[PDB]
Design a protein around this nucleic acid. Structure first.
Lengths: 256, 134, 199
RNA sequence: CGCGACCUCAGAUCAGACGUGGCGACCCGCUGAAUUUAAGCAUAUUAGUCAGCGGAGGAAAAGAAACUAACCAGGAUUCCCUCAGUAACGGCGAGUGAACAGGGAAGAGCCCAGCGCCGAAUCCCCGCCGCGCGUCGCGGCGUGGGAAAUGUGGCGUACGGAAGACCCACUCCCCGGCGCCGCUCGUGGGGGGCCCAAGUCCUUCUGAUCGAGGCCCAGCCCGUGGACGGUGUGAGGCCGGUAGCGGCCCCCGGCGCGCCGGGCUCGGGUCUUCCCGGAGUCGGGUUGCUUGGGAAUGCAGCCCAAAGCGGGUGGUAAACUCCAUCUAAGGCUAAAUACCGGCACGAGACCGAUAGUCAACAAGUACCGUAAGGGAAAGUUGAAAAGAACUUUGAAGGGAGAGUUCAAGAGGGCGUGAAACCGUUAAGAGGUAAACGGGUGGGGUCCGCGCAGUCCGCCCGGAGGAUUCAACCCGGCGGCGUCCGGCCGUGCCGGUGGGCGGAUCUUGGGACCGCCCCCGGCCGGCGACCGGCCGCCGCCGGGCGCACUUCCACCGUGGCGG
RNA sequence: CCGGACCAAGGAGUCUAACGCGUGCGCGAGUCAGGGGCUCGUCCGAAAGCCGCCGUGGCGCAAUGAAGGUGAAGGGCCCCGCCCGGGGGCCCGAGGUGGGAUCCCGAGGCCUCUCCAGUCCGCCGAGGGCGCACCACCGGCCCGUCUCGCCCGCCGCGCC
RNA sequence: UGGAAUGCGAGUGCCUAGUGGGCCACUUUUGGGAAGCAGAACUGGCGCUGCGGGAUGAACCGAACGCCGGGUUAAAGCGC
RNA sequence: CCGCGGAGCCUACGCCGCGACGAGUAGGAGGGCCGCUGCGGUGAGCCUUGAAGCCUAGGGCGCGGGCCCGGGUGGAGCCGCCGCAGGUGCAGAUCUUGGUGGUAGUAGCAAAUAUUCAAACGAGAACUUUGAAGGCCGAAGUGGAGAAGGGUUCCAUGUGA
RNA sequence: CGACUCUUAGCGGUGGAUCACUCGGCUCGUGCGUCGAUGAAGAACGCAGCUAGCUGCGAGAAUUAAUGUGAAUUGCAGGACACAUUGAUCAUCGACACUUCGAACGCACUUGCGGCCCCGGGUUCCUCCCGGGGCUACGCCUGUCUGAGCGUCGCU
């Protein structure tokens, strides 16, 4: 809010003895404003309680290692079809969830070929659900230049541009991402992992150099390696059903 | 999606410019589509509406296949008046009903040197675009 | 005011600080503006290195930093003279000049001289008039291999095992440091007492 | 005792110019409080801050060491990070509080006075001519005036400079008037103007749609354009636009290349001889303010008042001595930096008419005060005025009809239309003021596909219908498991490896080591890792199976379980 | 006692900085780019990504003294002129005592149709054993300071 | 032979709000003729707490509280 | 094995069993499928065959905060779930702004002697105009003119909001 | 029985909350970064066919010219523009024009009073009257002219 808001008037309290509250009051005469309260959060026309200030902390810094951790977790979840369907990404008839298409797509120039490719990869139902989700936002955001809302579609990861951005630009829901500039805000759209991603083979092969294996450090980032697992086997059922654990057990007490 | 950093997408700014536009900008804002036959003859899709233009109404209460003549272009009100698009007041007199030019189709345009010139400009520009795409 | 254990804090918020608060919301904007200024300058001086003139090697002046070497303001008049470069032609060639720098030692002088000779050999000199060349460079190295340098020109950047001999093995490192500090402290008064004893 | 010259002054509506005032967010020079904190209060703090005064610019100020440092030294100013809440100051209380080094952004250096040499070489004005000519510069001439020896100009300024002698190389320039093209790489460099795609298709909804279905090709059409506005409601394709190193037209430019005219046309080393500096200023005493600066950091008033192998600084006063460092009392200078005023723009996890600027509106307006000054309230008919013609009562306001509209339960302060308060209708009640909690009872409005009350599975009968079932054969798809192969691999050897590193050795190149990947051989395991045989099992389709099997519906006031 | 005639709307622990403790996450004797820079005009994007040949720097990794300054190894086993306590050599690598979750060994028991002689796994287990963290106590080491006392070193023979 | 009885699971660290006007009663007790006055000790209570009884009542007597059905009591009662 | 078959379970932050207990100011903590506004995701969510809002002797849910459905009115937007962020919840503050009651058809329309008859215009007359009576200011006036100050209030015609 | 009073519901009203909307703000950021004696900022008074305020303008006054555009403006009226013998409207804006105060400038702040030089009309070189035009402020710089001085001197 403005620093002058509510404080541009000249107003002093009348003091006690006048059968009125001791709030500051506008001086003078000959208008409705005379004698009215001022300088108070409880007064009409006064300033707010704790006026908002521009030097509020708007920005947060996250550690580089944690930011890289979040990207690795988002990538790993994008390869599990259960997690991607749990995002509502309509991955059926898609041949492989880690979808890899050739590098000719990078050279695409017309939106017609962008649409035809999505139709051939059976990723077009994702765009149709994005079309079905186009509606008007509820609230004041309609007066704040945010009138229309829609859901997210597939993310396309490329290596070289060569016109791929322009070809896929007009299709709603599609987000274009450079493999060397992976953005967590576009891989986990609402903090939720499991966004559908389509990769070019150049971006797919670059991905091992970018984040490294567990035997190799990252080649394109100095001093980085993948996070380690604190639990090698996550299959609780198999671990519990293994004869080693079962042999160490006491008989269960089913009687109620 | 708009990329020009000098073109506004703001609701208030676009509405303000529309609602207190100067008269010559209101002329191009009040453009109407040409007929399919006219779009075939001249390679033009739309022209700004003008007095003594033969149009038909394609939306609203007065929609139909009747052809009428534009008798008034009230640019301040953003409406045009057509010959037969009218109603009766309580008294008995007849008043024209304003129709937005975006809801009419030009079936015959008044032809003069200025109108021929801008018809040729719009066809030349479109033909260049088609050649560039090819 | 104080409540149990804590720190005695003395914040400097007694001076109407809210009128003088520097917010950095224009920080990204001044990075683009600085960047576009660099790119425009590089094009305007296109063949020239766009990183400024060549700076000399300089030693940092304090015990904390005298093991490091950085870039100085300009080559001194003594090293320019030894290299054989006129002080009024160095600026045109691309050599920074610092007329107010001295040369206490010779290794630092020779290091900066050799740096100047390496720059001169690596330099391409375009003729003033392209049609009529004179005492410049050849066509092969001028219009075929001339490129604008990207970073700073000549970037400035910062013992085999042997058998220990009996002499250095029997060396009193701590003892020598202690006597050395005593000798410096007592040097003046030892001489005064010797002079008084002589009298 | 007249006429001259110079000096110091004066007048002029003398010929040409220049200053004033405003704005003031940012900037420079002064002046300068108290509220407040110290739980009192005077020093301190607030604070060199608010108020007051003066002066500018698109930036200002600062600025090329009378510097830092004490190091193996750095090297103009300005800004950012850090130094650092540190050294230091402080009724050593409350509190205050920098700098150097280091990393960055930017980076650029120069000019006099003095000492000298050169016949004042210099400058202003006025004419004339050749010019050139966007609103004014060049060359000459002037037997044209003036300034200037009480000192203009050229050379030259601490990094030394000048003058002679020797040797070397020999000049790579500037300005004005003109043409070339890239017409500045973010596409033209900038400003302005005009343009450039695809449904308003078929059927339906509506007062009106931009709504809902559909549109052979696998999918209506364009998409480098699915930003946003407008349009009777919600629009990629109705319109303006939007995207595009898209098109066309006019104008204004800079940087390069060529033509003419004008000016200048000289350097660099080595040796020898000379020259070399800013005074009522520095410094000292004292007083007052100021600073983190403490036996005085900075500033100023008064008194004293210099020197020249001198002077200043070296964060504790002084004497002696050594060392380091710079060269004050003259001057100019872009960039990086600032910007609550101004001219244009863009955007927003902000507010949504008691909010957000006081001000969404004829708002610094109405109105108030003598004045300095104070300072509001106030948005919304409807898609479209289609804003109610006409009849009738009344003097009219105001009604009753009629009419417009999808709607007047939208009728010009008219979207929706709460509560407080009131009028009327319906129901109920009423002498301990009302109102309340807990129990019931009566009456009333509404509700219950309320008004012959359940529904499932198996079995038992009666009679009806149709057939696959059970098994068997063919085809397809699944599930499971030493049989085989490809992988994923640890470890382990052979390297065409040819790779990355290493504070290992070198005799930059190499050797050595550790890993990384790959190739070949051996070696273990299937689960977010693949196939193929061979079985076993299951499902589906087809055939045969043609009725004591199977299945589907009905009836019994049937029996068992729920 | 004071405020409240009634209704609507507005109306009061917020933001910044600094600390302290607790808790979630990442890395870990390190950790952190936050200031700057590199990547197409930059809808989003004033975002995100990267620097490592930007880690300058901040905090931590060393304390103590006003300062000049100085600055953190313990044990076990053998040998010794000398018997006041110190020297020498190997092996490891912070000592000892009492508690101490957990872990290890374990006499004796429980048993698969029966008896006998075996191989095991498990279970109960008296007793022992190594002992985490932490606590109490006793030793030891660094800095300041005090008392006592005998030595050692040398470009400076020293008020070292 | 775990060296009396009875009962009970203990120990320990950090951070920490409110409070820092009290008042009443049995017993003891100081000043005052005394006071529903002023000042102390111990315990319980009111304050922070409603419930049955004392007609009424901060403190008395009984008893302390989630929403209910049955049964029974406390203190106190049982002419209306 | 003449049957080829055998309920439910286990959102493990889930489900189940057993035992004891339940006062509370100041104050502390936990949970909230309680509520408000905006943002990122998601509901192939809802909506002109009717959104928000408002009213309700209707049907209900929850200990409660509150919520869902029916009906009426309205006419264009709105909500659920996973997270994010607040200018996020009112009975008080002689609170601020606006609106409204009872008082109450009440107090009051009482300073300077005084009005009456008839007519005219007019829808309408105690109050206007004309005429006739009765009275007052009584020349230091309730008269005739100016200065300050006001600024069209002056004059004619018309209206009666 | 009413009346009166209370409660509830329906409907109607003193009222303008809620919801939806927004040519407005606020905040951040970018590029520019320009007033004035050639008369600025700010005031005053005027200007439209009917027009008070806001707005725009200055005696050529809700605008002239020019260029671009290309058929309107509009509340009513009137007449342009024949919509090329080149032009309604709007935008742009480089030409022209720009009343009185105001740093404010002949003196003074009252529509007060001058002076000098010209022009026109009455009379004729009264410049007497009327009208019009140009000058007539302070400080200060270079130059110019006219001067002063028992200032310093020279020739007399």
């Amino acid at each position: 809010v403005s620093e002058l808001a509510g404080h541009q008037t000249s107003a002093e309290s009348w003091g006690t003895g006048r059968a009125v509250a001791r709030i500051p009051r506008v001086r003078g005469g000959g208008t409705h404003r005379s004698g009215q309260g001022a300088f108070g959060n409880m007064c009409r026309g006064g300033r707010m309680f704790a006026p908002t200030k521009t030097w509020r902390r708007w920005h947060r810094r996250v550690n580089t290692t944690q930011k890289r951790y979040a990207i690795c977790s988002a990538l790993a979840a994008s390869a599990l079809p259960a997690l991607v369907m749990s995002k509502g990404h309509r991955i059926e008839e898609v041949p492989e969830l880690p979808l890899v298409v050739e590098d000719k797509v990078e050279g695409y120039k017309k939106t017609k070929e962008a649409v035809q490719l999505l139709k051939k990869l059976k990723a077009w139902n994702d765009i149709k659900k994005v079309y079905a989700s186009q509606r008007m936002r509820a609230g004041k955001g309609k007066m704040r230049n945010r009138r229309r809302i829609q859901r997210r579609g597939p993310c396309i990861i490329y290596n070289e541009d060569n016109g791929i951005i322009k070809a896929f630009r007009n299709i709603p829901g599609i987000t274009l991402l450079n493999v060397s500039k992976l953005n967590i805000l576009k891989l986990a759209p609402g903090g939720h992992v499991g966004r559908f991603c389509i990769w070019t083979e150049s971006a797919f092969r670059k991905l091992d150099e970018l984040y490294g294996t567990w035997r190799k450090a990252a080649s394109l980032k100095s001093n980085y390696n993948l996070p380690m697992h604190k639990m090698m086997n996550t299959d609780l059922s198999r671990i519990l059903k293994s004869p080693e654990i079962q042999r160490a057990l006491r008989a269960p007490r089913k009687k109620i | 999606m708009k990329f020009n950093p000098f073109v506004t997408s703001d609701r208030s700014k676009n509405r303000k410019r529309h609602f207190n536009a100067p008269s010559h900008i209101r002329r191009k804002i009040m453009s109407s589509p040409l007929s399919k036959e006219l779009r075939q003859k001249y390679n033009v899709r739309s022209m700004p509406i003008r007095k003594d233009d033969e149009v038909q109404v394609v939306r609203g209460h007065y929609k139909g296949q009747q052809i009428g003549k534009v008798v008034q272009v009230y640019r301040k009100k953003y409406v045009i008046y057509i010959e037969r698009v009218q109603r009766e007041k309580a008294n008995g007199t007849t008043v024209h009903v304003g129709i937005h030019p975006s809801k009419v189709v030009i079936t015959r345009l008044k032809l003069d040197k200025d109108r021929k010139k801008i018809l040729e400009r719009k066809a030349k520009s479109r033909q260049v675009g088609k050649e560039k795409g090819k | 005011a104080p409540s149990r254990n804590g720190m005695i804090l003395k914040p400097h918020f007694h001076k109407d600080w809210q009128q003088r608060v520097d917010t950095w919301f224009n920080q990204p904007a001044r990075k683009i503006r600085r960047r576009k200024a660099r790119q425009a300058k590089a094009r305007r001086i296109a063949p020239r290195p766009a990183s400024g003139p060549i700076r000399p090697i300089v030693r940092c002046p304090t015990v904390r930093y005298h093991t490091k070497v950085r870039a100085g303001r300009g080559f001194s008049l003594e090293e320019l003279r030894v290299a054989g470069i006129h002080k009024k032609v160095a600026r045109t060639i691309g050599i920074s000049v610092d007329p107010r720098r001295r040369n206490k030692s010779t290794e630092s002088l020779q290091a900066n001289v050799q740096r100047l000779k390496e720059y001169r050999s690596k330099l391409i000199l375009f003729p003033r008039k392209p049609s009529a060349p004179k005492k410049g460079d050849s066509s092969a190295e001028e219009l075929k291999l001339a490129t604008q340098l990207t970073g700073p020109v000549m970037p400035i950047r910062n013992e085999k095992a042997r058998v220990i001999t009996e002499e250095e093995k029997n060396f009193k490192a701590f003892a020598s440091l202690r006597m050395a500090r005593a000798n410096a402290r007592l040097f003046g008064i030892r001489a005064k007492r010797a002079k008084e004893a002589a009298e």
